Amino acid sequence: MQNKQFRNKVLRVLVKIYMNLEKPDFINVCQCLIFLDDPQAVSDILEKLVKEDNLLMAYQICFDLYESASQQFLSSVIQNLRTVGTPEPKDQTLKMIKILSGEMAIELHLQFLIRNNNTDLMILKNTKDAVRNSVCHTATVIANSFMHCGTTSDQFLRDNLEWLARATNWAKFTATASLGVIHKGHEKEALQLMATYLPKDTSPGSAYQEGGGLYALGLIHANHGGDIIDYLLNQLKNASNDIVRHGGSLGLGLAAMGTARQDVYDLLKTNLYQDDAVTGEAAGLALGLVMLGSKNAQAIEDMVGYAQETQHEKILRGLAVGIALVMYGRMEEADALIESLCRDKDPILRRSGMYTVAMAYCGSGNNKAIRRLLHVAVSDVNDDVRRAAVESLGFILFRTPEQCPSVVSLLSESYNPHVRYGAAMALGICCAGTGNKEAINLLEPMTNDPVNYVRQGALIASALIMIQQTEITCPKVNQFRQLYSKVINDKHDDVMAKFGAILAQGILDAGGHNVTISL
């Protein structure tokens, strides 16, 4: 549990030993460059690739450094490597060009993930048997987006058109967004596929198709290098009501995540200056994404100054996530900011302090914030910070899966159902991708209670653990059978309990058991 005051020096002095040896190792330069993130520690290894004249060894370090461990440090190292070389000349050019591409991973993932799919008629037929026209209509298409993610399988949605556009509401927006979750990584078939739906009059009666086209396009071009953002500014400049603003703000902000461009900041501010709660919520969600690591001076004070001067709540949660996601790596900085903003009279901003401190203290590097996290989880009378409290606890304690259920086992069966639900989200996020049974043996008391909240979060938390698990290792028959009885027992259950039930069933079937999640 280092404080980063000496770890970076110990690493930057222990990386000088392998360069003097007979051969350089990759595990130490990776495990150091994932923490120190210093430009002076990469300028040597990026220029030694030409001196060593070894092509095969650079592909691994380039693949994983360009893969993860940085976004803006990659945005700087791409031009640092762009400056090196010509403004073996013929080989270094194709090397430097082909290493920063990053689309080869999308091609191979699209290839094996295009030839490894496994679909069954029992799941989708069961969804059509349990589908309702009001609530779970979005659950069926979000589960279909989960199972058909990456495989671009629109043939399931090509069966009939009377099951999707039968109701003019947000269900079509979630259907087109779910379509954006189905296919991803397409520079021509995406925009062409969206334009081919109604290229007749250029006037859709339902704007949710256009808003879902912009939001879905932002889902497709997430973190891509061939962004169409330049065209998305001329398309967002068009005057439209709550669909180009909302869907265009979400898609444009997601596509411009990490760029820290002042242009999207300006047009985003003039997009939120209309005092509307929905386009301001999307403006906050986009501003938090695009401001990753920027830490603008007047932006935080402008948002917190914009918070208390309005009565809407969606603007307060949108700016809450907006000022929450912007805070990354400010452990030594946001102490007075979060400590000062913790005593605010607004419960929404009180949740924004914990959501903000969640990503700031990732890595279990601060045992102090938990004092006020659990202290406001138990002491405060409003259930908003109580159910929104322990998400930061799981986000900081995601390292150890065993230590979480020992301290959240009391929160499994808490006083109010809100701490039970937020604690269910905590068990869902802390034990995800692992095999710890300390939450699984506690899932049985969570799944039976007169309150539908703890049942919904219990089915979601149970759905986040059973993924990527074999039956011969652990007896999962209990939660498989009790999870399968919810879609047949939906007649005697609540309307939202079946929503979270089939929505929880779409988690295991996501991608046909091929794709998973990792923290």
């Binding site: 086992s409 009391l410 069966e413 808490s414 006083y415």
Partner: protein, 49 residues
């Protein structure tokens, strides 16, 4: 030598006594959280009332 087995040996034994203090804090957390489950179950019971 005679340090890792003797000096670090008594340091490890002192670490075992620290594990005894963490067993007092441990079982204090256990019985305090079980009594916490009793009060939570009673106040939750009158909440069911």
């Amino acid at each position: 030598l005679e340090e890792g087995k003797a000096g670090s040996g008594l340091r490890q034994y002192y670490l075992s006594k620290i594990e005894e203090l963490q067993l007092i804090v441990n079982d204090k957390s256990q019985n305090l959280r079980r009594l916490q489950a009793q009060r939570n179950e009673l106040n939750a019971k009158v909440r069911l009332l």
